[model samples]
Target: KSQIPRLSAINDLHKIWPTVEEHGAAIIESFLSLDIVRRLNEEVDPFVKIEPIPAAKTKDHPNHILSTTTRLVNVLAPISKAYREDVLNSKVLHRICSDAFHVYGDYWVLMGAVMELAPSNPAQPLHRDMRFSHPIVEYLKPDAPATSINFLVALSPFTAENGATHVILGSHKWQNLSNVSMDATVRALMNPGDALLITDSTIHCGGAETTGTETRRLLTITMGISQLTPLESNLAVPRPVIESLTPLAQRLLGWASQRSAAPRDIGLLTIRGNSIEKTMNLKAEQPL
Candidate 1:
């Protein structure tokens, strides 16, 4: 409760980043309009039942498979223009990620998926978002930039009964895994439209649900500093689908190349040399 850092979505980045800088995470109130959230839920609902990837393993299993009642729905950018325009290209999320990883101003979209935790869904094991990049992240200077950031926007109410997310308070400062435990966790209770902003170092997970009637719906966007990898696979999106996003969205989704000249020259080119969105638009304006 009081242990959780809190802020308003309308607040300035300079005023807001300090909370996340000090605590491992922060709760952003009213991060989106209810209207927007409602649309997102509707757009994402149908896809939940049609997952090409199964959530459950074999009906006739032996003894060796990790099963999940928690389901995932992705490839959303095409189905929900609201998702493309609002969540993936969120104004607030990008600014905070830029500040967190200021060593590199550019941040890339990693996971942008709508996750539903049903009543029967058990809690996931606690884990760090930067688990894959731990080699570099562990050695980072305490003063160095964060390796990644995540914005988990609640698309439905996150009640304790509905298995709200659990975050380890101030766990980011503990560099060793041996220091980790569930002793300091707190439920990130939130209303639809509220968002939880967390650093890559913080330990967190989806909590188990007890209310048989409630389904915890969430849209999570995980990001990494420019040099890291991409998804819940935003790059898996079709080029035609990405062409319709805002210029900023187009860039974040890997339609534009990344270049760095100040610190020993880093360059990442995705669509040849320039933005595929711009190229495609220009190509289609009046072509034969």
Candidate 2:
């Protein structure tokens, strides 16, 4: 079917993993509560409304250019309490990521930000997100373990006219990006609090905001295999904010060190093969 799979937040990791593995994307209903969504929107409101995005120019490439009018507010966890507590600590997502990249032993937050599709913004380029941060994935087979997984939580209603995401189903399995057509993509229609769970290899982009007044907002969070570096500068997050997070959230932010299976012992570790958080003076938690 052309329609995207839809699941409720109460669904377990087993139910959620199928959508990710099959379609490479799915709509997770009520991924955030009404209260959390409200607070998240309010917290990022200041920056999303004022962030500098010099008007979008013509496209440079089919899979590279980002429309400048579409704004992204970085370092979300530190700024929004609701984001750090409820969203980042999502149990279902946590388990699913661990399963997807089980070979890596663990996964960590790849990035956290607020993406706002301003009024009259153009559609984002159709591209695989892995190309931006993890180019090595291209060398492996399409069935190889996913390097990155994303959750785009809608803080504002994702309406068809107001730039809901455009995703091409099963594009993750395609060998060449050049074969896809624009007509194959579908808008992921959703209300506030709903989320889009997408994989790194999937072809996706923000849709054009046809309405000249409404702005679409999404909490853009990505989880990557623990072996890679994250996209955002998470280390710069305030010390107080870092200390306030749950242990899982802290680990997702790369607070813990990861140890690989027999063939590899070299993981992100200090001289003592312990969590780097010890150096930061934060209380010690178990290593990954």
Candidate 3:
């Protein structure tokens, strides 16, 4: 039998987007490196403590270091323009974004963590990534856009025993089912540099870590629409940093992006709202 291909690069991504759009997710491979992964890991830890391994789930013992909110923009701000463009223009990423959001926008506000699954950590409870609520749910009337496009890259080897992520195939299509069984889940084994492009609907969780010696480390990046308002309040990043970014990066971080006048339309409107206006507007507003 022929081996299944994981979407890792632009070429592979082109092949996978059709399937993922229909099913809501797909596993990718060969998208990152040990050195870049290591640097990113180091850069993000200063902002937030990796969420400790949850006590309730012991099967996938692990440590989490995250860069949620504006910290993501802060970290990736200094990376080379070529690196940023490579990710943005890559066929695999572009297609997945199109399928997920169906719009033209810059991708920024990455959300990810360096997950280390050790022998002591074990696997975790099966769960989906749909726990968070967003204004996008109300946008487009009924068909809201994905708040972000999900991508994961392995920095170390991943396998079933090492607590590689296990995902239920086509589970995104079934909305009524509460969960999928581990037996039905497929482990996403990939090379150290491989990447997985996925959507919000996927039902996934860490697999069991039977071996205590091996560790599973991953760099997951969630691409946010530049046109959307950022979730980070106190986006306290310095102005010099914003000025230093390339025009593209500035746009993603909401510096030079086209300003919208409609208060109820885009995220920038909220950020730019006058203090008095915020005090007067207490009603719920929809996402652009």
Q: What's every prediction's RMSD, in angstroms?
A: 4.2, 4.3, 8.8
Per-residue alpha-carbon lDDT of candidate 2 for residues 59-106, written as tens digits (9 for 90 to 100) = 232223457666777778767878888887877777677678877666
Q: Please, what are the lDDT tens digits per residue for candidate 3 over residues 264-286? A: 54534344544222434322211
RMSD of 3: 8.8
The better-scoring model by TM-score among 1 and 3 is: 1
Model 2 weakest 10-residue run by lDDT:
54-63
Model 2 vs. true fold: TM: 0.88
Model 1 Cα lDDT, one tens digit per residue, 226-256: 6776644565666667656766676666666
Query: What TM-score, over all chains together, does every model reach?
Result: 0.84, 0.88, 0.65
How far does residue 264 in candidate 3 sit from its true spot (Å)? 14
| Deviation in Å, model 3, residue 24 alpha carbon | 2.9
Error of 3 at 52 (Å): 7.2
Candidate 1 TM-score versus the reference:
0.84
Score each candidate by Cα lDDT: 0.72, 0.78, 0.53
User: Best-fitting candidate, measured by lDDT?
Assistant: 2
